[PDB]
């Protein structure tokens, strides 16, 4: 079903409803905007198979650049063209925009100021609510950036739902907006991130997957906060069997994460194996990926 | 006396010092901004007069023709050109630049947001201090549109003063503000104001002139918020010669305004007689400036 394939991972759809009478119509797009980086993770690539998701549905995918750190980028602008290779290496074909800022730029940028009030405007904020005005306007300079030149849908991590629920406010376009969750980080503090050594990069070599896989935060018959459940429940394909040691029980059959889910709560799966398992998954998983550097 | 010069009627001057230091300048420059209008009145020309005194003591001039109603592109700009021709009437030659809306622009504004603060931000306001984003925002896009781009001094009417005194702590570059003060409508209630009949145009008939003088506010002893009096301080010369009937008195020769003032607050000269000097003495003044019309 195209509707709950999409829906399929999603922590938010803001208009359910709204998302089917959308898949209705022709001519559909969805953008999503990335902060280029230096290493694509697992946790960008969450996000490229839910666009996935939606250019299976017939969306057009706009995939907006995101510097808003104008205050170099003839250093930032491959790390996108690097970053589109990745997406593209991923299987992803779509239409690129960059912050790019033309001249009716202010002026609808004011025009959503007048509508957005100061109590309303601090909702929006990140948690270091405390002011300069660059604050203030901030938020509405985010909610302009949202590529809706003509696009159904928005979408974006978690992290980015205060300033999508203002955008949904503001703009003359209703658009619906589809909230993918946040990967822990491998060593179970904040998300993953390029840092820590706490993220894998689609590129890893099969060494380094395993490598860091072997030291993640995974305790035993824990599922909330654990890194490597949730690397299971994102990426992996299913049935899926386990090889493991005799004393441990042999071979293990899962039909599903849910299934995989009780044997790890009940520890009938240890840590161990859970993590050998996710290494190999994964390394075949990324390896056709990585294979796409000639 | 240069420094003298440019002082004379002018409310206030930021760092009298500082701009004793610019004098000495071989090469200096001087802005001001007006909203385009419709008539251009003895409040433009209030201006359009300290401008001159200016480019008298070897500033540049430059005017800015301010579309900040942005929020069109073919009313705005002519009406421009027609208050060009004005005040190349008034016998200023000065360069011109108007509203833009750049590449550069929105970065700007942000870098003057970052250091502006709320509280700061608010001061700056009309008393609408009181909200909408936009209100905030205002103030540094107005500050930016202070054409300061390499300007020595700029000027404006005491109206704009709480911006100014803004933008003295925001620009990078510590700009000399020359404040001209406002001249209170005909019939004696605000700034003189293209309507409500309280404006003399500079381009009115002698007929026209008459009228509006005839009936304009002038209470007998008052000097305070009386705009008749405020005409003969601004544009008229001394001595200055009163006709009157003998029976009143016969004619008067006043050598400066001081002199004119102590006479008026003493009821030593009547109304009647003052209008009628100011009528005719400004019919003589602008004369030249209405027939620059082609």
Do not use: W
């Not at 905007?33 to 299976?56: A, C, V």
């Not at 790019?100 to 601090?122: F, G, H, I, P, Q």
């Amino acid at each position: 079903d195209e509707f709950e394939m999409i829906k399929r991972n999603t922590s938010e759809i803001i208009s359910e409803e709204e998302l089917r009478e959308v898949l209705k119509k022709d001519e559909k797009s969805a953008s999503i905007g990335f902060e280029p980086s230096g290493k694509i993770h697992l946790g960008h690539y969450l996000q490229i198979k839910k666009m996935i998701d939606l250019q299976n549905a017939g969306f057009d995918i706009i995939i907006a650049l995101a510097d808003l750190h104008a205050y170099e980028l003839d250093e930032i602008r491959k790390i996108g063209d690097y970053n589109k290779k990745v997406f593209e290496a991923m299987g992803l074909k779509a239409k690129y925009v960059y912050g790019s800022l033309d001249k009716d730029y202010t002026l609808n940028v004011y025009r959503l100021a007048l509508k957005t009030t100061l109590k309303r405007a601090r909702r929006s904020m990140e948690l270091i609510a405390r002011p300069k005005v660059a604050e203030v306007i901030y938020p509405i300079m985010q909610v302009n950036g949202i590529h809706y030149k003509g696009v159904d849908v928005a979408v974006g991590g978690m992290e980015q739902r205060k300033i999508h629920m203002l955008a949904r406010e503001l703009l003359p376009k209703k658009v619906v907006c589809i909230h993918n969750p946040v990967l822990t980080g491998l060593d179970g503090e904040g998300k993953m991130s390029s840092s820590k050594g706490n993220f894998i990069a689609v590129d890893d070599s099969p060494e380094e997957i395993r490598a860091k896989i072997k030291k993640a935060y995974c305790p035993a018959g824990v599922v909330e906060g654990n890194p490597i459940m949730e690397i299971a429940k994102y990426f992996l394909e299913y049935p899926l069997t386990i090889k493991r040691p005799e004393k441990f029980g042999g071979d293990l059959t899962v039909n599903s994460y849910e299934e995989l889910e009780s044997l790890f709560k009940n520890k009938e799966l240890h840590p161990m194996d859970l993590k050998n398992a996710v290494a190999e998954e994964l390394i075949k998983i990324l390896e056709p990926i990585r294979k796409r550097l000639l």
